[PDB]
Every structure is written in structure tokens, then in C-alpha cells.
């Protein structure tokens, strides 16, 4: 199931929905989590915190089913709103979702 | 600069 991108809420951006599964069985080998490293508590120039992908394992789920790259801002993790949450916040969000066999992350390009 | 492993 590929990912899709629909018009943002401002009509000037594209917000797609990315679904990742921590099955750990990508074509590469086993991986570890889903396929990309994310960061939290990244205070932007707007005045709010968010999440950013530090890196993506070429071949992992996040790459094949997600299709993103380090630098993308994920305003949604596991169907939860991250905007406003700091590094410690995201930590709880993701970690809590790290146990789930499926995840839903959204970004903004 | 990291945060969580995914």
C-alpha cells in the first residue's frame, strides 16, 4: 500500500499520510524499528516544536512504504498530534507506539 | 542530534 499526498489545510502545501509497520523484515534483513530515525523538540522559526527525520535506511519499510528522507517534518505520529510537544513529549508518543505493530505518520513538504 | 529510533 503506497502513500498519498493531499492538499494541506492552507491550500499551498501537500500533506500526505504515511503508514509504517515495525515488523522488522524489510528486503534488507531485519532492520530494527520501521525504517527511519526521528527527532523531537525541534523549535522552528514559528515558535512550535515538532519532529524531524534524522535518517532513513534505504530499503526499510519507511523507505519502501513511507518514501521519505532525513529532514522531513512529521507533525503526526501514530495518529497523535505532535505540534507543541518537545523532545521528551515525542519520546513518550513514539515509544508508546514502538510496541504497536502498525504506525501512522504524517509530514509536510 | 537524535531523538527516537524508528
Nearest-angstrom CA–CA distance, A40 and A34: 17
The distance of B2 to chain A (nearest Cα, Å) reads: 5
Nearest-angstrom CA–CA distance, A87 and A92: 9
In chain A, the domains with their CATH numbers are 1-109 (2.30.42.10)
How many residues comprise chain A?
109
The distance of A84 to chain B (nearest Cα, Å) reads: 16
Please report which helix (H) or strand (E) contains residue A96, including its range: helix A87-98
Nearest-angstrom CA–CA distance, A38 and A91: 10
B 1-6 near A (Cβ less than 8 A): 1-6
Nearest-angstrom CA–CA distance, A105 and B5: 14
Instruction: Name the structure determination technique.
Output: NMR
Amino acid at each position: 500500500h503506497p502513500v498519498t499526498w493531499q492538499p494541506s489545510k492552507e491550500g499551498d502545501r501537500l500533506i500526505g499520510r504515511v503508514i509504517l509497520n515495525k515488523r522488522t523484515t524489510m528486503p534488507k534483513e531485519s532492520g530494527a524499528l520501521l525504517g527511519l530515525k526521528v527527532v523531537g523538540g525541534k523549535m522552528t522559526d514559528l515558535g512550535r516544536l515538532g519532529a524531524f527525520i534524522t535518517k532513513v535506511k534505504k530499503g526499510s519499510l519507511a523507505d519502501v512504504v513511507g518514501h521519505l528522507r532525513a529532514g522531513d517534518e512529521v507533525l503526526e505520529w501514530n495518529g497523535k498530534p505532535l505540534p507543541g510537544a518537545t523532545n521528551e513529549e515525542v519520546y513518550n508518543i513514539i515509544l508508546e507506539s514502538k510496541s504497536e505493530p502498525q504506525v501512522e505518520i504524517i509530514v509536510s513538504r | 542530534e537524535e531523538g527516537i529510533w524508528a
